[PDB]
Amino acid sequence: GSHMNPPPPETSNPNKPKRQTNQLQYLLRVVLKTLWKHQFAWPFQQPVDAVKLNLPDYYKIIKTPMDMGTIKKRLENNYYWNAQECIQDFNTMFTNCYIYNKPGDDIVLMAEALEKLFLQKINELPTEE
Ligand SMILES: Nc1cc(I)ccn1
Ligand SMILES: Nc1cc(I)ccn1
């Protein structure tokens, strides 16, 4: 990709301790699966390419970028220790959208639809065993 986009968030690091939990399995098999296939997922399936979108200020404003493509890699490549780390990544993705964009912009309506599904699924996050 372009030198004018930042490196994507970390998805590989052997020094970071890893664990499978039943909650992380739910986040991959239920939460990410549900959001990824949504009609409104596509803007969120990869990092924001600020060059291609002609948003040169995007990474001046958004200093903690996150997207579902990164989360999918982190879940599939066992990057997390716990569910809270992954829930935080989803919440960062939504708040980036809401901070950068005007309320009622199409992408905001798209993010809000995904966030409503997300909340319903996370309220049913299973008890950790
Ligand atoms: N190509 C695109 C377009 C949007 I809006 C968001 C992400 N990627
Ligand atoms: N100078 C710039 C930077 C970006 I990122 C996109 C367009 N023009």
mmCIF file of N, CA and C and ligand atoms in Angstrom:
data_model
loop_
_atom_site.group_PDB
_atom_site.id
_atom_site.type_symbol
_atom_site.label_atom_id
_atom_site.label_comp_id
_atom_site.label_asym_id
_atom_site.label_seq_id
_atom_site.Cartn_x
_atom_site.Cartn_y
_atom_site.Cartn_z
ATOM 1 N N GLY A 1 0.831 -1.206 0.000
ATOM 2 C CA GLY A 1 0.000 0.000 0.000
ATOM 3 C C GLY A 1 0.857 1.244 0.000
ATOM 4 N N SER A 2 0.206 2.390 0.024
ATOM 5 C CA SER A 2 0.870 3.703 0.012
ATOM 6 C C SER A 2 1.717 3.936 1.257
ATOM 7 N N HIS A 3 2.881 4.584 1.103
ATOM 8 C CA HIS A 3 3.676 5.134 2.203
ATOM 9 C C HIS A 3 2.965 6.234 3.001
ATOM 10 N N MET A 4 1.895 6.796 2.446
ATOM 11 C CA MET A 4 1.163 7.877 3.101
ATOM 12 C C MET A 4 0.077 7.339 4.027
ATOM 13 N N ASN A 5 -0.194 6.047 4.012
ATOM 14 C CA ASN A 5 -1.048 5.423 5.027
ATOM 15 C C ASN A 5 -0.169 4.887 6.128
ATOM 16 N N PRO A 6 -0.598 4.888 7.385
ATOM 17 C CA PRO A 6 0.211 4.316 8.440
ATOM 18 C C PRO A 6 0.258 2.811 8.264
ATOM 19 N N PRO A 7 1.248 2.154 8.905
ATOM 20 C CA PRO A 7 1.212 0.716 9.038
ATOM 21 C C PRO A 7 -0.088 0.291 9.733
ATOM 22 N N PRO A 8 -0.641 -0.853 9.396
ATOM 23 C CA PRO A 8 -1.857 -1.296 10.073
ATOM 24 C C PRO A 8 -1.608 -1.682 11.526
ATOM 25 N N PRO A 9 -2.652 -1.810 12.357
ATOM 26 C CA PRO A 9 -2.435 -2.289 13.714
ATOM 27 C C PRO A 9 -1.786 -3.670 13.688
ATOM 28 N N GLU A 10 -1.004 -3.884 14.748
ATOM 29 C CA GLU A 10 -0.276 -5.139 15.004
ATOM 30 C C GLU A 10 -1.245 -6.332 14.922
ATOM 31 N N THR A 11 -0.927 -7.384 14.205
ATOM 32 C CA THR A 11 -1.734 -8.636 14.202
ATOM 33 C C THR A 11 -0.903 -9.898 14.482
ATOM 34 N N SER A 12 0.407 -9.700 14.613
ATOM 35 C CA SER A 12 1.439 -10.751 14.788
ATOM 36 C C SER A 12 2.466 -10.255 15.783
ATOM 37 N N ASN A 13 2.686 -11.003 16.857
ATOM 38 C CA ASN A 13 3.814 -10.626 17.722
ATOM 39 C C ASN A 13 4.054 -11.777 18.652
ATOM 40 N N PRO A 14 5.080 -12.609 18.431
ATOM 41 C CA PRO A 14 5.337 -13.725 19.350
ATOM 42 C C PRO A 14 5.619 -13.382 20.788
ATOM 43 N N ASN A 15 5.970 -12.170 21.078
ATOM 44 C CA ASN A 15 6.293 -11.825 22.478
ATOM 45 C C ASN A 15 5.027 -11.605 23.281
ATOM 46 N N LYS A 16 3.901 -11.380 22.649
ATOM 47 C CA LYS A 16 2.618 -11.132 23.357
ATOM 48 C C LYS A 16 1.983 -12.455 23.728
ATOM 49 N N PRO A 17 1.708 -12.737 25.023
ATOM 50 C CA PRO A 17 1.079 -14.014 25.400
ATOM 51 C C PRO A 17 -0.348 -14.152 24.838
ATOM 52 N N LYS A 18 -0.689 -15.378 24.424
ATOM 53 C CA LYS A 18 -1.921 -15.659 23.653
ATOM 54 C C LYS A 18 -2.775 -16.560 24.479
ATOM 55 N N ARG A 19 -4.076 -16.489 24.329
ATOM 56 C CA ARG A 19 -4.870 -17.588 24.893
ATOM 57 C C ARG A 19 -6.150 -17.684 24.126
ATOM 58 N N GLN A 20 -6.611 -18.907 23.975
ATOM 59 C CA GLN A 20 -7.985 -19.168 23.521
ATOM 60 C C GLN A 20 -8.872 -19.105 24.766
ATOM 61 N N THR A 21 -9.991 -18.402 24.666
ATOM 62 C CA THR A 21 -11.055 -18.498 25.678
ATOM 63 C C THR A 21 -12.366 -18.780 24.931
ATOM 64 N N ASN A 22 -13.321 -19.341 25.658
ATOM 65 C CA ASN A 22 -14.671 -19.561 25.074
ATOM 66 C C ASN A 22 -15.299 -18.212 24.631
ATOM 67 N N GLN A 23 -14.980 -17.137 25.327
ATOM 68 C CA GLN A 23 -15.502 -15.821 24.929
ATOM 69 C C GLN A 23 -14.879 -15.362 23.608
ATOM 70 N N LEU A 24 -13.572 -15.565 23.441
ATOM 71 C CA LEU A 24 -12.927 -15.210 22.158
ATOM 72 C C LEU A 24 -13.477 -16.081 21.031
ATOM 73 N N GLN A 25 -13.745 -17.350 21.288
ATOM 74 C CA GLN A 25 -14.351 -18.220 20.258
ATOM 75 C C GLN A 25 -15.724 -17.681 19.850
ATOM 76 N N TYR A 26 -16.512 -17.216 20.812
ATOM 77 C CA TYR A 26 -17.812 -16.592 20.522
ATOM 78 C C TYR A 26 -17.618 -15.323 19.699
ATOM 79 N N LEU A 27 -16.635 -14.517 20.062
ATOM 80 C CA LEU A 27 -16.398 -13.293 19.260
ATOM 81 C C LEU A 27 -16.076 -13.618 17.807
ATOM 82 N N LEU A 28 -15.398 -14.702 17.517
ATOM 83 C CA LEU A 28 -15.094 -15.056 16.117
ATOM 84 C C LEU A 28 -16.308 -15.687 15.455
ATOM 85 N N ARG A 29 -16.890 -16.693 16.106
ATOM 86 C CA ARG A 29 -17.885 -17.575 15.448
ATOM 87 C C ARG A 29 -19.250 -16.913 15.450
ATOM 88 N N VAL A 30 -19.560 -16.031 16.354
ATOM 89 C CA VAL A 30 -20.893 -15.404 16.425
ATOM 90 C C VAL A 30 -20.756 -13.931 16.075
ATOM 91 N N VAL A 31 -19.937 -13.178 16.777
ATOM 92 C CA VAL A 31 -19.971 -11.714 16.617
ATOM 93 C C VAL A 31 -19.356 -11.300 15.282
ATOM 94 N N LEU A 32 -18.110 -11.652 15.044
ATOM 95 C CA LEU A 32 -17.453 -11.231 13.789
ATOM 96 C C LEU A 32 -18.207 -11.846 12.615
ATOM 97 N N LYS A 33 -18.599 -13.105 12.700
ATOM 98 C CA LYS A 33 -19.347 -13.779 11.594
ATOM 99 C C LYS A 33 -20.594 -12.967 11.234
ATOM 100 N N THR A 34 -21.341 -12.495 12.212
ATOM 101 C CA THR A 34 -22.628 -11.780 11.997
ATOM 102 C C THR A 34 -22.324 -10.429 11.351
ATOM 103 N N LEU A 35 -21.357 -9.702 11.882
ATOM 104 C CA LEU A 35 -21.092 -8.332 11.385
ATOM 105 C C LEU A 35 -20.439 -8.407 9.999
ATOM 106 N N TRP A 36 -19.559 -9.342 9.746
ATOM 107 C CA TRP A 36 -18.777 -9.382 8.499
ATOM 108 C C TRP A 36 -19.705 -9.502 7.286
ATOM 109 N N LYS A 37 -20.787 -10.259 7.435
ATOM 110 C CA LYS A 37 -21.667 -10.549 6.279
ATOM 111 C C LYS A 37 -22.750 -9.501 6.136
ATOM 112 N N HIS A 38 -22.848 -8.538 7.017
ATOM 113 C CA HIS A 38 -23.879 -7.496 6.938
ATOM 114 C C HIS A 38 -23.702 -6.668 5.669
ATOM 115 N N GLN A 39 -24.860 -6.283 5.098
ATOM 116 C CA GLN A 39 -24.878 -5.436 3.891
ATOM 117 C C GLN A 39 -24.006 -4.196 4.061
ATOM 118 N N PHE A 40 -23.888 -3.668 5.297
ATOM 119 C CA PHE A 40 -23.161 -2.412 5.544
ATOM 120 C C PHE A 40 -21.742 -2.663 6.053
ATOM 121 N N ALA A 41 -21.238 -3.873 6.002
ATOM 122 C CA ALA A 41 -19.889 -4.168 6.528
ATOM 123 C C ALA A 41 -18.773 -3.596 5.692
ATOM 124 N N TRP A 42 -18.949 -3.444 4.364
ATOM 125 C CA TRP A 42 -17.788 -3.259 3.469
ATOM 126 C C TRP A 42 -16.882 -2.088 3.850
ATOM 127 N N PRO A 43 -17.331 -0.942 4.324
ATOM 128 C CA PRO A 43 -16.385 0.124 4.648
ATOM 129 C C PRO A 43 -15.471 -0.231 5.819
ATOM 130 N N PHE A 44 -15.849 -1.251 6.573
ATOM 131 C CA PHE A 44 -15.207 -1.601 7.842
ATOM 132 C C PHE A 44 -14.365 -2.845 7.700
ATOM 133 N N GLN A 45 -14.255 -3.464 6.527
ATOM 134 C CA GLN A 45 -13.598 -4.774 6.366
ATOM 135 C C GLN A 45 -12.086 -4.635 6.143
ATOM 136 N N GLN A 46 -11.540 -3.438 6.147
ATOM 137 C CA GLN A 46 -10.096 -3.205 5.942
ATOM 138 C C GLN A 46 -9.784 -1.849 6.541
ATOM 139 N N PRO A 47 -8.493 -1.575 6.787
ATOM 140 C CA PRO A 47 -8.122 -0.238 7.234
ATOM 141 C C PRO A 47 -8.566 0.851 6.259
ATOM 142 N N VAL A 48 -8.882 2.004 6.777
ATOM 143 C CA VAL A 48 -9.225 3.172 5.957
ATOM 144 C C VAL A 48 -8.016 3.534 5.087
ATOM 145 N N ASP A 49 -8.225 3.510 3.790
ATOM 146 C CA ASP A 49 -7.180 3.892 2.814
ATOM 147 C C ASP A 49 -7.421 5.366 2.521
ATOM 148 N N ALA A 50 -6.764 6.186 3.301
ATOM 149 C CA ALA A 50 -6.984 7.646 3.259
ATOM 150 C C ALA A 50 -6.495 8.234 1.935
ATOM 151 N N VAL A 51 -5.554 7.593 1.297
ATOM 152 C CA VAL A 51 -5.073 8.078 -0.019
ATOM 153 C C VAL A 51 -6.179 7.836 -1.018
ATOM 154 N N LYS A 52 -6.690 6.615 -1.069
ATOM 155 C CA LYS A 52 -7.652 6.287 -2.110
ATOM 156 C C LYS A 52 -8.930 7.089 -1.892
ATOM 157 N N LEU A 53 -9.337 7.322 -0.654
ATOM 158 C CA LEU A 53 -10.554 8.086 -0.323
ATOM 159 C C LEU A 53 -10.326 9.600 -0.334
ATOM 160 N N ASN A 54 -9.112 10.055 -0.611
ATOM 161 C CA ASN A 54 -8.808 11.514 -0.603
ATOM 162 C C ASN A 54 -9.217 12.123 0.732
ATOM 163 N N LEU A 55 -8.762 11.524 1.825
ATOM 164 C CA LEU A 55 -8.999 12.033 3.193
ATOM 165 C C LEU A 55 -7.650 12.268 3.819
ATOM 166 N N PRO A 56 -6.880 13.280 3.362
ATOM 167 C CA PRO A 56 -5.520 13.399 3.863
ATOM 168 C C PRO A 56 -5.426 13.672 5.365
ATOM 169 N N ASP A 57 -6.469 14.215 5.965
ATOM 170 C CA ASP A 57 -6.466 14.495 7.407
ATOM 171 C C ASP A 57 -6.913 13.279 8.239
ATOM 172 N N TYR A 58 -7.259 12.140 7.638
ATOM 173 C CA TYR A 58 -7.898 11.067 8.415
ATOM 174 C C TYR A 58 -6.995 10.639 9.564
ATOM 175 N N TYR A 59 -5.736 10.323 9.259
ATOM 176 C CA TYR A 59 -4.807 9.825 10.283
ATOM 177 C C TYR A 59 -4.150 10.975 11.039
ATOM 178 N N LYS A 60 -4.508 12.207 10.744
ATOM 179 C CA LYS A 60 -4.192 13.340 11.644
ATOM 180 C C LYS A 60 -5.208 13.349 12.788
ATOM 181 N N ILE A 61 -6.469 12.994 12.488
ATOM 182 C CA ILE A 61 -7.570 12.984 13.483
ATOM 183 C C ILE A 61 -7.586 11.640 14.220
ATOM 184 N N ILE A 62 -7.558 10.545 13.488
ATOM 185 C CA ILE A 62 -7.729 9.185 14.054
ATOM 186 C C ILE A 62 -6.348 8.613 14.335
ATOM 187 N N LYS A 63 -5.996 8.619 15.591
ATOM 188 C CA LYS A 63 -4.669 8.154 16.041
ATOM 189 C C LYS A 63 -4.758 6.740 16.575
ATOM 190 N N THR A 64 -5.934 6.150 16.704
ATOM 191 C CA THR A 64 -6.066 4.766 17.168
ATOM 192 C C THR A 64 -6.949 4.060 16.156
ATOM 193 N N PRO A 65 -6.462 3.797 14.961
ATOM 194 C CA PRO A 65 -7.297 3.187 13.963
ATOM 195 C C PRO A 65 -7.617 1.741 14.281
ATOM 196 N N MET A 66 -8.797 1.306 13.836
ATOM 197 C CA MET A 66 -9.154 -0.118 13.932
ATOM 198 C C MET A 66 -10.198 -0.431 12.884
ATOM 199 N N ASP A 67 -10.247 -1.648 12.462
ATOM 200 C CA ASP A 67 -11.192 -2.078 11.414
ATOM 201 C C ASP A 67 -11.451 -3.566 11.622
ATOM 202 N N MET A 68 -12.500 -4.098 10.991
ATOM 203 C CA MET A 68 -12.863 -5.500 11.159
ATOM 204 C C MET A 68 -11.907 -6.434 10.457
ATOM 205 N N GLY A 69 -11.215 -6.006 9.409
ATOM 206 C CA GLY A 69 -10.210 -6.869 8.813
ATOM 207 C C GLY A 69 -9.091 -7.159 9.778
ATOM 208 N N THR A 70 -8.650 -6.163 10.518
ATOM 209 C CA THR A 70 -7.642 -6.357 11.565
ATOM 210 C C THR A 70 -8.193 -7.224 12.672
ATOM 211 N N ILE A 71 -9.426 -6.978 13.087
ATOM 212 C CA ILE A 71 -9.997 -7.805 14.179
ATOM 213 C C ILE A 71 -10.094 -9.255 13.713
ATOM 214 N N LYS A 72 -10.545 -9.480 12.480
ATOM 215 C CA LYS A 72 -10.656 -10.855 11.940
ATOM 216 C C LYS A 72 -9.298 -11.542 11.981
ATOM 217 N N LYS A 73 -8.274 -10.874 11.577
ATOM 218 C CA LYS A 73 -6.905 -11.448 11.631
ATOM 219 C C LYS A 73 -6.519 -11.726 13.080
ATOM 220 N N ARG A 74 -6.785 -10.789 13.975
ATOM 221 C CA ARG A 74 -6.418 -10.988 15.397
ATOM 222 C C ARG A 74 -7.170 -12.193 15.957
ATOM 223 N N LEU A 75 -8.424 -12.368 15.638
ATOM 224 C CA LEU A 75 -9.175 -13.533 16.136
ATOM 225 C C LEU A 75 -8.671 -14.815 15.470
ATOM 226 N N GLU A 76 -8.522 -14.840 14.156
ATOM 227 C CA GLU A 76 -8.134 -16.079 13.445
ATOM 228 C C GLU A 76 -6.694 -16.473 13.780
ATOM 229 N N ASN A 77 -5.812 -15.515 14.063
ATOM 230 C CA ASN A 77 -4.380 -15.757 14.335
ATOM 231 C C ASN A 77 -4.105 -15.701 15.813
ATOM 232 N N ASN A 78 -5.120 -15.813 16.662
ATOM 233 C CA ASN A 78 -4.996 -15.935 18.143
ATOM 234 C C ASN A 78 -4.058 -14.833 18.679
ATOM 235 N N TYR A 79 -4.428 -13.570 18.510
ATOM 236 C CA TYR A 79 -3.599 -12.477 18.988
ATOM 237 C C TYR A 79 -3.946 -12.077 20.402
ATOM 238 N N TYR A 80 -5.170 -12.351 20.820
ATOM 239 C CA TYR A 80 -5.716 -11.807 22.090
ATOM 240 C C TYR A 80 -5.415 -12.731 23.262
ATOM 241 N N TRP A 81 -5.390 -12.110 24.431
ATOM 242 C CA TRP A 81 -5.444 -12.822 25.728
ATOM 243 C C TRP A 81 -6.875 -12.910 26.236
ATOM 244 N N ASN A 82 -7.699 -11.913 26.006
ATOM 245 C CA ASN A 82 -9.069 -11.954 26.561
ATOM 246 C C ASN A 82 -10.068 -11.278 25.628
ATOM 247 N N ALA A 83 -11.332 -11.440 25.959
ATOM 248 C CA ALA A 83 -12.415 -10.849 25.166
ATOM 249 C C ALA A 83 -12.425 -9.357 25.279
ATOM 250 N N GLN A 84 -12.074 -8.792 26.385
ATOM 251 C CA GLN A 84 -12.125 -7.348 26.553
ATOM 252 C C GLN A 84 -11.215 -6.670 25.523
ATOM 253 N N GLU A 85 -10.048 -7.226 25.226
ATOM 254 C CA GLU A 85 -9.176 -6.624 24.202
ATOM 255 C C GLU A 85 -9.894 -6.548 22.865
ATOM 256 N N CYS A 86 -10.618 -7.564 22.506
ATOM 257 C CA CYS A 86 -11.290 -7.609 21.184
ATOM 258 C C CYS A 86 -12.528 -6.708 21.185
ATOM 259 N N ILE A 87 -13.318 -6.740 22.259
ATOM 260 C CA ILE A 87 -14.451 -5.794 22.407
ATOM 261 C C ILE A 87 -13.944 -4.370 22.299
ATOM 262 N N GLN A 88 -12.828 -4.054 22.926
ATOM 263 C CA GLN A 88 -12.259 -2.710 22.817
ATOM 264 C C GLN A 88 -11.943 -2.383 21.362
ATOM 265 N N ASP A 89 -11.402 -3.309 20.600
ATOM 266 C CA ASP A 89 -11.115 -3.049 19.176
ATOM 267 C C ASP A 89 -12.400 -2.730 18.432
ATOM 268 N N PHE A 90 -13.483 -3.487 18.619
ATOM 269 C CA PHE A 90 -14.756 -3.123 17.967
ATOM 270 C C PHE A 90 -15.194 -1.720 18.376
ATOM 271 N N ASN A 91 -15.148 -1.416 19.659
ATOM 272 C CA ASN A 91 -15.593 -0.101 20.139
ATOM 273 C C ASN A 91 -14.710 0.992 19.555
ATOM 274 N N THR A 92 -13.414 0.770 19.438
ATOM 275 C CA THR A 92 -12.534 1.776 18.803
ATOM 276 C C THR A 92 -12.977 1.997 17.374
ATOM 277 N N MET A 93 -13.224 0.939 16.617
ATOM 278 C CA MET A 93 -13.662 1.098 15.233
ATOM 279 C C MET A 93 -14.912 1.960 15.134
ATOM 280 N N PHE A 94 -15.907 1.686 15.955
ATOM 281 C CA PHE A 94 -17.145 2.480 15.887
ATOM 282 C C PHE A 94 -16.861 3.925 16.278
ATOM 283 N N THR A 95 -16.127 4.137 17.364
ATOM 284 C CA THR A 95 -15.918 5.529 17.801
ATOM 285 C C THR A 95 -15.048 6.263 16.759
ATOM 286 N N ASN A 96 -14.104 5.656 16.112
ATOM 287 C CA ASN A 96 -13.374 6.370 15.058
ATOM 288 C C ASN A 96 -14.349 6.921 14.022
ATOM 289 N N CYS A 97 -15.306 6.106 13.621
ATOM 290 C CA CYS A 97 -16.275 6.506 12.604
ATOM 291 C C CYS A 97 -17.074 7.712 13.079
ATOM 292 N N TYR A 98 -17.511 7.654 14.324
ATOM 293 C CA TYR A 98 -18.387 8.688 14.878
ATOM 294 C C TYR A 98 -17.587 9.951 15.127
ATOM 295 N N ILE A 99 -16.330 9.864 15.428
ATOM 296 C CA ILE A 99 -15.497 11.076 15.637
ATOM 297 C C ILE A 99 -15.163 11.727 14.311
ATOM 298 N N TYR A 100 -14.844 10.958 13.292
ATOM 299 C CA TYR A 100 -14.349 11.564 12.053
ATOM 300 C C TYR A 100 -15.488 12.118 11.205
ATOM 301 N N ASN A 101 -16.608 11.439 11.179
ATOM 302 C CA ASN A 101 -17.688 11.721 10.217
ATOM 303 C C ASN A 101 -18.788 12.553 10.840
ATOM 304 N N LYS A 102 -19.552 13.256 10.021
ATOM 305 C CA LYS A 102 -20.741 14.018 10.489
ATOM 306 C C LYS A 102 -21.855 13.067 10.863
ATOM 307 N N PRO A 103 -22.660 13.373 11.892
ATOM 308 C CA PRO A 103 -23.756 12.515 12.296
ATOM 309 C C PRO A 103 -24.710 12.393 11.109
ATOM 310 N N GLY A 104 -25.342 11.248 10.963
ATOM 311 C CA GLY A 104 -26.212 11.099 9.775
ATOM 312 C C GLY A 104 -25.505 10.978 8.405
ATOM 313 N N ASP A 105 -24.171 11.140 8.239
ATOM 314 C CA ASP A 105 -23.439 10.673 7.038
ATOM 315 C C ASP A 105 -23.768 9.185 6.830
ATOM 316 N N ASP A 106 -23.807 8.718 5.597
ATOM 317 C CA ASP A 106 -24.081 7.324 5.336
ATOM 318 C C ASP A 106 -23.183 6.410 6.158
ATOM 319 N N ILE A 107 -21.878 6.642 6.235
ATOM 320 C CA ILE A 107 -21.026 5.656 6.968
ATOM 321 C C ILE A 107 -21.435 5.606 8.455
ATOM 322 N N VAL A 108 -21.866 6.744 8.997
ATOM 323 C CA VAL A 108 -22.315 6.728 10.401
ATOM 324 C C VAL A 108 -23.541 5.855 10.559
ATOM 325 N N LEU A 109 -24.519 5.982 9.652
ATOM 326 C CA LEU A 109 -25.705 5.088 9.694
ATOM 327 C C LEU A 109 -25.282 3.630 9.545
ATOM 328 N N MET A 110 -24.290 3.365 8.735
ATOM 329 C CA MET A 110 -23.795 1.982 8.530
ATOM 330 C C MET A 110 -23.153 1.486 9.816
ATOM 331 N N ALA A 111 -22.273 2.271 10.396
ATOM 332 C CA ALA A 111 -21.647 1.902 11.672
ATOM 333 C C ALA A 111 -22.709 1.700 12.748
ATOM 334 N N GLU A 112 -23.708 2.544 12.810
ATOM 335 C CA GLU A 112 -24.731 2.406 13.861
ATOM 336 C C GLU A 112 -25.516 1.111 13.707
ATOM 337 N N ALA A 113 -25.793 0.662 12.482
ATOM 338 C CA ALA A 113 -26.490 -0.613 12.265
ATOM 339 C C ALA A 113 -25.584 -1.728 12.765
ATOM 340 N N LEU A 114 -24.311 -1.717 12.423
ATOM 341 C CA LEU A 114 -23.400 -2.791 12.904
ATOM 342 C C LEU A 114 -23.274 -2.759 14.426
ATOM 343 N N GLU A 115 -23.231 -1.568 15.004
ATOM 344 C CA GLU A 115 -23.074 -1.448 16.467
ATOM 345 C C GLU A 115 -24.313 -1.973 17.190
ATOM 346 N N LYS A 116 -25.486 -1.780 16.630
ATOM 347 C CA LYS A 116 -26.701 -2.307 17.257
ATOM 348 C C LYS A 116 -26.622 -3.818 17.287
ATOM 349 N N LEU A 117 -26.175 -4.471 16.209
ATOM 350 C CA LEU A 117 -26.037 -5.943 16.194
ATOM 351 C C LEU A 117 -24.949 -6.324 17.183
ATOM 352 N N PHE A 118 -23.837 -5.604 17.139
ATOM 353 C CA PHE A 118 -22.762 -5.912 18.072
ATOM 354 C C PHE A 118 -23.253 -5.927 19.507
ATOM 355 N N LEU A 119 -23.940 -4.907 19.926
ATOM 356 C CA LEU A 119 -24.413 -4.809 21.332
ATOM 357 C C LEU A 119 -25.309 -5.993 21.651
ATOM 358 N N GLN A 120 -26.216 -6.351 20.761
ATOM 359 C CA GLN A 120 -27.118 -7.479 21.044
ATOM 360 C C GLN A 120 -26.276 -8.719 21.250
ATOM 361 N N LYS A 121 -25.271 -8.928 20.422
ATOM 362 C CA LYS A 121 -24.438 -10.136 20.559
ATOM 363 C C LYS A 121 -23.591 -10.073 21.802
ATOM 364 N N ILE A 122 -23.044 -8.947 22.173
ATOM 365 C CA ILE A 122 -22.131 -8.887 23.337
ATOM 366 C C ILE A 122 -22.913 -8.975 24.625
ATOM 367 N N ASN A 123 -24.174 -8.594 24.632
ATOM 368 C CA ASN A 123 -24.981 -8.798 25.849
ATOM 369 C C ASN A 123 -25.149 -10.286 26.130
ATOM 370 N N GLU A 124 -24.999 -11.133 25.139
ATOM 371 C CA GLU A 124 -25.070 -12.598 25.258
ATOM 372 C C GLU A 124 -23.687 -13.252 25.253
ATOM 373 N N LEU A 125 -22.617 -12.484 25.425
ATOM 374 C CA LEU A 125 -21.283 -13.069 25.538
ATOM 375 C C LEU A 125 -21.338 -14.054 26.669
ATOM 376 N N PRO A 126 -20.888 -15.301 26.435
ATOM 377 C CA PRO A 126 -21.093 -16.335 27.404
ATOM 378 C C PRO A 126 -20.193 -16.101 28.570
ATOM 379 N N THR A 127 -20.663 -16.645 29.691
ATOM 380 C CA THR A 127 -19.856 -16.700 30.902
ATOM 381 C C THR A 127 -18.526 -17.386 30.575
ATOM 382 N N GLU A 128 -17.423 -16.820 30.997
ATOM 383 C CA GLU A 128 -16.073 -17.415 30.757
ATOM 384 C C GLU A 128 -15.953 -18.738 31.514
ATOM 385 N N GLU A 129 -15.569 -19.815 30.831
ATOM 386 C CA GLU A 129 -15.328 -21.119 31.496
ATOM 387 C C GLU A 129 -13.837 -21.435 31.409
HETATM 388 N N1 LIG B 1 -13.225 1.727 -0.144
HETATM 389 C C1 LIG B 1 -13.680 2.097 1.051
HETATM 390 C C2 LIG B 1 -14.707 3.031 1.176
HETATM 391 C C3 LIG B 1 -15.120 3.388 2.445
HETATM 392 I I1 LIG B 1 -16.658 4.782 2.714
HETATM 393 C C4 LIG B 1 -14.515 2.822 3.549
HETATM 394 C C5 LIG B 1 -13.514 1.911 3.348
HETATM 395 N N2 LIG B 1 -13.089 1.541 2.127
HETATM 396 N N1 LIG B 2 -1.268 15.098 0.381
HETATM 397 C C1 LIG B 2 -2.182 14.117 0.414
HETATM 398 C C2 LIG B 2 -2.157 13.105 1.399
HETATM 399 C C3 LIG B 2 -3.112 12.091 1.354
HETATM 400 I I1 LIG B 2 -3.111 10.589 2.837
HETATM 401 C C4 LIG B 2 -4.050 12.074 0.324
HETATM 402 C C5 LIG B 2 -4.024 13.095 -0.615
HETATM 403 N N2 LIG B 2 -3.114 14.094 -0.593
#
